[PDB]
């Protein structure tokens, strides 16, 4: 997954 946040 790419993720959902900018950091962490």
């Amino acid at each position, epitope marked *: *997954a*790419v*993720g*959902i*946040g900018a*950091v*962490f």
Partner: antibody
Amino acid sequence: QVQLQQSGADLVRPGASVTLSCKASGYTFTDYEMHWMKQTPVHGLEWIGAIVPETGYTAYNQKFKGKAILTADKSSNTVYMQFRSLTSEDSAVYYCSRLKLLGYFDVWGTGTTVTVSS
Amino acid sequence: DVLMTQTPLSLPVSLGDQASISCKSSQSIVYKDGNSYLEWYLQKVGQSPKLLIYRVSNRFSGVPDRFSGSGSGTDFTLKISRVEAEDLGVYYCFQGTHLPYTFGGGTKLEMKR
């Protein structure tokens, strides 16, 4: 010893509101986001949404926006998912999983079976 | 959202033989600059899913080299040569670029013996 310990299986009345917990241990909590999956024997696996705890920033599948509410306790290294009005379609096994940016679901929780029944 | 299509949804294979699972994404799942975040997981009855592949062709740490992921554009394939009883379960493919993330219907690997 990365560990995601989920709460125990439940029976909840239709229209009730239940709270599942996922306690992380063995790594630095605020470095990862917690994503939540739903598994049913007919549908299969579904992504519900995610929370980045260090910040508290959530994002939800439109199927589950409104019903599932993700929060995060940074002290106890815990992530909560709330179901606000349970339906017969909410009976499932719910999973938490950790993720860092551009990563993958490497560590999974043990799953919380929710049965909605009268 | 993007629909992931696994085929077959149940796959019988003789012991020691080869097996291939086809997973097709309805849209492109290439991330703006880096590869499509196409991951393969395996689940056994009564266990959490386990990660095998990420970034279509990267084996995860500890996974036997008998598992190989491939594909481009929207066409993806998992290949298990020399299948052992330890490889039983439901294999799910999964996209992790476009929200909401989605899984395929799963594919049940079953031994002939």
